[PDB]
Design a protein around this nucleic acid. Structure first.
Lengths: 24, 35, 391, 139
RNA sequence: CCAUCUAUAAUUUUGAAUAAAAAUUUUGCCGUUGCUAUGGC
């Protein structure tokens, strides 16, 4: 059964500018 | 308008060449109507 | 305690504004009033006025905010911007720019105006003329603030880039006049944005920008010389690219007029140390395919003797070789014969490069190798009559 | 920081417009000479025209999708303006024409289920014959 | 392929020093164990 288990496993732009200004 | 201020002789000619080439076609058509 | 309630409070405002039915959605209710002809005009004006206060209110918090609550305010902001159409959003916000007294809010407001036009079409042409006029009128006022001064220029650059030709001619000419004055601004950011606006404006106007030609190229060349001296400038790379892309823009739009000042263009390309070689080599290929090869060959001799020969810069020498080999492989048979005395005069200088070169043996051998292959190409593609005296 | 970001964004915008394939902003000297010379031919062979087409298409889809959203959304609100106007008897001349068209549209469709007049001629006669014998009522 | 010429690395002079400068010439991945060696896939 363990062998079968291994087989089973094997098969906004403004947002960025807005945050940067707050850092300054 | 043909801009002459601060432009060398060659640049002025290019403005003339574009204007005169375009105006020629209409002018040739105009003389044909009269002739 | 206090902060947790605010986190919940903006979640509460987000829930109502969220566009998760005609009666439920705030956006659809707004459209119905606008579409409904019988709706009183005064009622419409209230909708515009209320939104402006609403938009300013959310921006005030975002400006003065907490990571999770910062995200939520943007969720609220995203819902707010979509409440009403572009037609009314411009009418309700552009007046607010002058009204707003905070530099941060004005900076926020300019960005959102640009974003609304990112996904619009030709239906917004009459609107954009109104927007451009307001931005032009404010530009003298925000000369004090660098960030707002630069952002307004960037938004104008985008608006001119997108359906710029369709815009009325007066704004385009007025925009170009504005940029040329601001190229002299001491702030490097204003120089970069001003150069970008000139490139797009010159692209739209084409030959009609020739009246401004004395105010674009001669100042730009002088700007480049100052750029080399100030190597400590944190934006040196962006500035040098901006000057280069300006020439690339007008090399494609006004080749004949730039034909006279082509020597200074090549001076910028070779000695622009900060710019990557790929950028410099690409803008070179524009010169060959757009500007007459006869003048390039004539200029290539003067630039070599004056600057490149004594430069002792590997990138400058390699770029010079790339130009020369491109011209000879593209120059016409008639053109090659006419300019034969100039090229051979250049060739003799190249053969003598070993005497004055400070490089090691391998480089000079490699440089001479390329000099000989281009010479054979150029000596071929001629006739006996022209070559016999030269030999 | 924003000053740096805003400056880079503008310059990167120009690079795409004018020099598409060129990348964006973010040893022995003899070797350096050769690499630049090799870069010349490689850049010359790049299919820049293909790159412009991809940028055009991705932008076109976004605009087209957004345009449909406005067209789809305004149709909803247009219908609700009709709903309130007809209820309150505020029906305009244009509004009264759209509804009249719907009467024609719906009535036209129901004609298909109504069937042709010719078949009703024979069907009616058959119906009478079946009815008369079943219902009787002669007595 | 060989030779040559470069590149990389080491000793040395001015040098507090950086610096230039002549000059010369154990694993694909994951552990444990030392300051090296061997356990799993």
């Amino acid at each position: 059964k363990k062998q079968v288990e291994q087989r089973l496993e094997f098969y906004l732009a403004i947002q960025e500018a807005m945050e940067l200004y707050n850092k300054d | 308008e043909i801009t002459v201020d601060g432009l060398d002789a060659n640049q002025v000619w290019w403005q003339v060449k574009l204007v005169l080439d375009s105006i020629d076609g209409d002018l040739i058509q105009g003389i044909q109507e009269l002739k | 305690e206090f902060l947790t309630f605010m986190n919940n409070t903006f979640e509460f405002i987000n829930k109502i504004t969220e566009e998760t039915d005609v009666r439920r959605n705030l956006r659809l209710k707004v459209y119905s009033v606008l579409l409904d002809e019988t709706s009183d005009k005064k009622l419409i004006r209230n909708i515009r006025e209320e939104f402006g206060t609403l938009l300013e209110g959310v921006l005030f918090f975002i400006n003065s905010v907490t990571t999770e609550i910062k995200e939520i305010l943007f969720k609220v902001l995203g819902n707010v911007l979509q409440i009403l159409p572009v037609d009314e959003f411009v009418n309700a916000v552009l007046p607010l720019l002058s009204t707003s007294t905070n530099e941060d809010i004005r900076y926020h407001l300019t960005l959102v105006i640009g974003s609304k036009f990112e996904l619009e079409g030709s239906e917004a042409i009459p609107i954009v003329n109104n927007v451009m006029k307001v931005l032009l009128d404010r530009m003298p006022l925000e000369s004090k603030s660098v960030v707002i001064s630069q952002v307004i220029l960037n938004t104008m650059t985008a608006l001119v880039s997108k359906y710029g030709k369709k815009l009325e001619g007066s704004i385009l000419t007025q925009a170009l006049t504005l940029a040329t004055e601001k190229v002299s601004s001491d702030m490097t950011e204003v120089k970069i944005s001003s150069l970008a606006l000139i490139t797009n404006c010159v692209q739209v106007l084409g030959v009609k920008s020739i009246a401004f030609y004395p105010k674009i190229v001669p100042p730009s060349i002088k700007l480049f010389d100052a750029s080399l001296a100030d190597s400590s400038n944190p934006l040196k790379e962006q500035l040098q690219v901006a000057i280069l892309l300006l020439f690339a823009g007008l090399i494609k739009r006004i080749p004949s007029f730039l034909m006279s000042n082509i020597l200074d263009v090549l001076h910028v390309i070779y000695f622009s140390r900060e710019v990557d070689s790929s950028i410099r080599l690409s803008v070179i290929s524009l010169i060959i395919e757009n500007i007459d090869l006869k003048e390039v060959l004539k200029v290539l001799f003067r630039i070599w003797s004056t600057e490149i020969a004594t430069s002792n810069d590997t990138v400058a020498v390699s770029l010079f070789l790339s130009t020369l080999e491109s011209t000879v492989e593209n120059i016409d048979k008639k053109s090659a014969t006419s300019q034969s005395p100039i090229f051979f005069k250049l060739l003799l200088s190249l053969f003598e490069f070993r005497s004055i070169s400070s490089f090691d043996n391998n480089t000079i051998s490699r440089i001479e190798a390329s000099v000989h292959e281009i010479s054979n190409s150029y000596v071929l593609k001629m006739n006996d009559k022209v070559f016999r005296p030269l030999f | 920081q924003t000053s740096k970001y805003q400056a880079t964004s503008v310059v990167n915008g120009l690079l795409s417009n004018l020099l598409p394939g060129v990348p964006k902003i973010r040893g022995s000297k003899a070797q350096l000479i050769d690499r630049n010379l090799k870069k010349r031919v490689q850049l010359q062979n790049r299919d820049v025209h293909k790159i412009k087409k991809k940028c055009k298409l991705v932008k076109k889809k976004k605009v087209k999708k957004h345009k449909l959203d406005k067209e789809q959304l305004e149709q909803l609100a247009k219908h609700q303006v009709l709903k309130k106007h007809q209820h309150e008897g505020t029906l305009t001349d244009h509004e009264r024409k759209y509804l009249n068209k719907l009467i024609k549209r719906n009535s036209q469709n129901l004609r298909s289920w109504d069937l042709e007049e010719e078949v009703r001629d024979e069907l009616e006669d058959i119906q009478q014959s079946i009815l008369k014998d079943t219902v009787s009522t002669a007595n």
